[PDB]
Symmetry: D2
Subunit: 367 residues, 4 copies
């Protein structure tokens, strides 16, 4: 009943089985309770970290696994099938370390990367706003202004920040949890995806060392643009895992429940609905792996990653809406998980670039 | 920012005007808090009933307002744009009086009908069981004949207004022509209600199960002949399916108004125009479809196919429009700072009750055979 | 098996039965042959004309029927179910007379309207181009330039023309068939809708009397804008009739053909496809009548007419594509009509304002 | 303006390069005229065969090119972007050699296989009858046993390359396990072909019926055991469904390139951007889906579900992309001055043959049971 996967090696299959074993004993027994109460899973990230699952695609020299995206994306997909909000946070952690790895000095990487990729820390990514500025000073910078929609806000070990210093008018910072002048608003009240908090930040004459600026002064916009494709790939794989979870529920229910003297899967009309869901899940998985396989070969994959995010998140919204339908009246109650999965899928159409903005990007790439 | 309506007279126009006033004064200011807390709205059904709004379509000789469906359904639409859960309950009340009005004895009508349509009472309708929602004929609640009556033993489920209605229209087994209809009072001995279902949305009016424990009932409470029940339940389908078509259209219209206002406060420019255009087409199309079926009914013509088409069309539109309305707001659309996330949760169950959209398609195909 | 219609009177029902009787003996026995050979139905318009069907909505004082749009649109729908290209031409004829009726002088109407609405003439409408100018002269105007996509081009008795004389820089003309300086290109080779020709026009120092200018000099753009809503309503009703014809074929075929030991309509999956088609036909008919009913009461109906054209033409493309599917392999051959109906529906999405341009119009009406 | 392909080696890249050259030189300059006139392309299959293009996937020990499906299918895609009717015929030729290659005797293979894969021959595949397309088991063409052979009496239909192939793979009735397979030569006595079907599109290679009139055949021509036929026909389904997925993707890609060029010559501005964006997503998604199934096959793993999904997905995409490509051109898109009106007519039959898209859905649902 588990997905039959296309994998490059024996060691990759054994990584998949390891993820499935940890997810089923650390994630599955606690997910419904924490999402209902909107409480934080303390200690869950440490256990994922110790099994090597928080630093899979980063180079081994810096303490990562050096796994390709074709393998890493599928592990992410397996996590999301058990707990979507935790999978989103695992993806955010990968992006949070990208500036230092790609643009940091040799001195900066020896100082901080081992710690970031040890499995004991968790990172957050901070660029969105509701005009946040860093002004020069002796030996560094002073920060003033506001930030919005930070995943893991208030709970992370470190924060990646973008702040104004025209074209080359932006700069990137590695900000520590203990930063003087830094505070966080209350967690947002959302329709779903409750466990990992989402918060805004406020900087009040916050002073920072020059040694925490990542890359050259003005290199900000280039740094942030360099991480778009990888983020969209992350969310494509998360949406695919939630679509798979909703499909597994419906398939199981349609093989037990009966009406008019037969199992409901045996009514041809209902069978066709289930068939469209399964085709949409398999098309979304095929599309993200095709982009992944380009990235692993050092080929351009920018158009392909926008297509993958678009395809996968539209698929999840359609499949979860249809899984409630398969259940009937009980599917509309909290005795089952399908109502929660439908609430989680809607926000995937919106973040990491809205789907309208994905269509715009694809268009500009044909003009 | 108010729907331009096609109405048969100046009188109907003022009745719409009366509805907008009551809904904006009584329903709109308390709806967010009651849906969030999951509590019952005391006093609300008493206020609508005194205005005439709970008995519009029924004949005046029995205390109704005599209105045609072309007017009744559009009043229902205006209500549902403020509070979907309340309008669903209004629709159920109409169905709950239907078996007595069409099938009862003149003596039975004289007893009970005037109190039902008075504006102070609330009706509920009870047909579904756990092993039988879509498939009606497989029901099993037992009503077995006694000296001058019946004894009822069994279970029912998914009762809208369960545990709060003044009367219940019941369907129980006496023997294919084995089913009968009953008017059950709220004080019936042996009758009890389980706890309210915990749902994804539509929280205010409760949905509950029922249990009959040696519930002896007078044989004068039976509506129609013994074994007539499935014919009674079948005759109400057309009317109920139009009710819900009107409710889904008003929920879609409410979500469309939120998104138009937001896109103007421009966010429209920064392909949102085309998304809003497709939303506006969906609402207009659903409204015209339910009205076409209504005029056929008002004229005394066949309207069964057209009523299935209206319900399917209007509920598929609410699910699509509410989902795209969250999309128009962006990230704040996904928070409880606005109403659109609630509207999306309310639309899903509409695709499911009053005959699922797969049953609707099966009805339509049969009408082509 | 004929459509059950909502009609205002006894006399309207009897108009419907008259249309059905004429269409079934004048149109149905000859449509497949003329469309296959791409030849013109000489004499068909005279017979429609003599039964009063070419001037149904124009006022009785000028020789029309004074019928409301709620009745006229449904007659048009009945014609289109038998021969779509002839129905489009009937609609074009209504528009061709609109300028003179609404903006013409009392002298101009006594001269020409009775003839136009007698049933012996046929009119065409000429505004599209691939910059056509009328320059002043003693006693009138001289015309130079080109026009495109004229339905009935080369075969009409009269032509409604728009030509340049900024804001108020356009003027409208009633041009006769015998106009010196006027010629027509060869008929366009289209995917379908062959019987009534579509042509371009060329004006070569073409001199015209001032008495043929309709309305004031500069009133052109206002005249042309005043006819948009009515045209869109015409095409909505034509698309609805072609969708109905494709649905009737498929329903008939699905009740005879058998597979796996049962009539194919009895396979629930196929039954659901037929059910979606029927719902789309009924939704399109409901939408155009709702706009019609506004126009009959002197209420605004501009947004509603754009919605109706959009809804109905998208419905026809979906229903005709699905009717071929119901037929299987035989549906892809010219032994049946469903392949022709699919070719006819595509051009309805395009003309009288493309569907993208309809979406734009609806958007501007919410801004 | 050329597809960026993922390929397993430099050798495969050059084979793609060879395909683009032959297709642009031989197919592209004559395609519009032959499809318009409805005539056969003499010399064309002879030229592709000498380049190795008619036997790519089969083993070298028998004269094929040994290519995996991940390469074969993408060559098929490049062809179909120039001439859809020709690429369909290439796909059929592969299926026509399949029963002999997997089920025959070593002695049977030695006789006939090398000539089939030589590049000079053309194969056809014959299964469907008028009373049996979707439902295979209901076939009725009779093959009755004689002294050292069989006698064939009956009718077959919808034969691609009917009346022009060098050999025919036939399925006829001998007795559920009542069906057998036959390799029929083009010079068989008692065999005749009806006139070409008049179709909406795909005109160049003819589709015809066949008639067997006391057609005596040698018992050494039977492929596999007596009563093995339905198992043989079943085993070819997975392969044929991928062939057509590749053909539909290349037809969609051709229609996408036309519309992108036109929108740039701006027409894009005057919501065409969003329509083109959805077209580009549909093509990319169909390509990735057929390739995922191909790599499973190349690895010797189960790929049945994934092959049904690929065919359904890729043909639904061709119908949607070709229909929107006419839309991008406007009025001139509806004329025979451009290719897009032809592409739209070609896409419709793809939803129908090699198992209709309703049968595909039925296969997928069963795999979930
Ligand atoms: C909030 C709420 C309020 C309600 N209020 C009332 C009420 O007041 N009175 C009342 O009588 N009922 C009420 N109901 C019950 C409601 O009408 C049923 O839940 C619904 O109609 C479907 O029945 P089910 O839940 O048993 O689904 P099932 O019948 O178990 O169906 C499950 C799935 O199988 C499919 N299916 C079933 N049969 C077929 C078929 N023949 N062909 C193809 N597919 C099929 C369905 O479409 C569905 O997707 C209420 C329900 C809810 C959720
Ligand atoms: C151009 C062309 C070339 C062809 N070439 C070949 C060839 O080379 N070799 C060959 O063997 N065949 C060939 N065919 C035949 C082709 O495979 C069939 O036409 C097709 O698969 C469908 O069968 P049918 O036409 O009898 O449709 P039918 O089986 O009559 O089906 C009609 C409709 O009913 C539906 N239906 C049928 N069964 C079910 C079911 N169980 N559940 C739900 N719905 C169902 C179908 O989806 C379809 O919509 C060719 C056909 C064409 C058009
Ligand atoms: Na430590
Ligand atoms: Na005359």
């Amino acid at each position: 009943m588990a997905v039959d996967r296309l994998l490059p090696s024996q060691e990759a299959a054994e990584l998949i089985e390891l993820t499935r074993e940890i997810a089923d004993k650390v994630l599955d027994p606690i997910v419904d309770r924490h999402e209902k109460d909107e409480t934080y899973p303390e200690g869950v990230f440490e256990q994922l970290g110790a099994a090597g699952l928080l630093s899979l695609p980063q180079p081994e020299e810096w303490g990562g696994g050096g796994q390709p995206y074709e393998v890493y994306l599928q592990v992410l997909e397996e996590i999301a099938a058990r707990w979507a909000s935790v999978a989103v946070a695992v993806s955010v952690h990968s992006l949070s370390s990208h500036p230092l790895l790609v643009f940091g000095t040799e001195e900066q990487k020896k100082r901080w990367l081992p710690g970031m990729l040890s499995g004991e820390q968790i990172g957050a990514y901070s660029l969105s706003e509701p005009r946040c500025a860093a002004t020069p000073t002796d030996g560094g910078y002073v920060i003033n202004g506001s930030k919005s929609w930070i995943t893991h806000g208030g709970k992370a070990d470190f924060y990646t920040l973008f702040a104004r210093t025209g074209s080359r008018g932006v700069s990137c910072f590695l900000v520590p949890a203990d930063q003087p002048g830094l505070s966080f608003g209350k967690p947002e009240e959302k329709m779903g995806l409750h466990a990992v908090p989402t918060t805004s930040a406020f900087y009040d004459n916050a002073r920072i060392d020059a040694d925490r600026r990542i890359g050259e002064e003005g290199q900000g916009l280039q740094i942030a643009f360099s991480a778009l494709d990888s983020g969209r790939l992350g969310i494509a794989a998360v949406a695919t895992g939630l679509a798979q979870a909703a499909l597994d529920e419906a398939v199981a229910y349609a093989n037990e429940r009966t009406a008019f003297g037969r199992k409901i899967i045996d009514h041809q009309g209902l069978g066709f609905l289930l068939a469209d869901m399964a085709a949409a899940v398999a098309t979304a998985r095929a599309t993200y792996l095709d982009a992944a396989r380009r990235r692993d070969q050092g080929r351009p994959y920018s158009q392909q990653a926008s297509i993958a995010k678009l395809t996968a998140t539209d698929a999840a919204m359609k499949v979860t809406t249809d899984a409630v339908q398969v259940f009937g009246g009980v599917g509309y109650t909290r005795d089952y998980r399908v109502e929660r999965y439908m609430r989680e899928a809607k926000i995937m159409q919106i973040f990491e670039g809205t789907n309208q903005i994905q269509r715009l990007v694809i268009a500009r790439g044909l003009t």
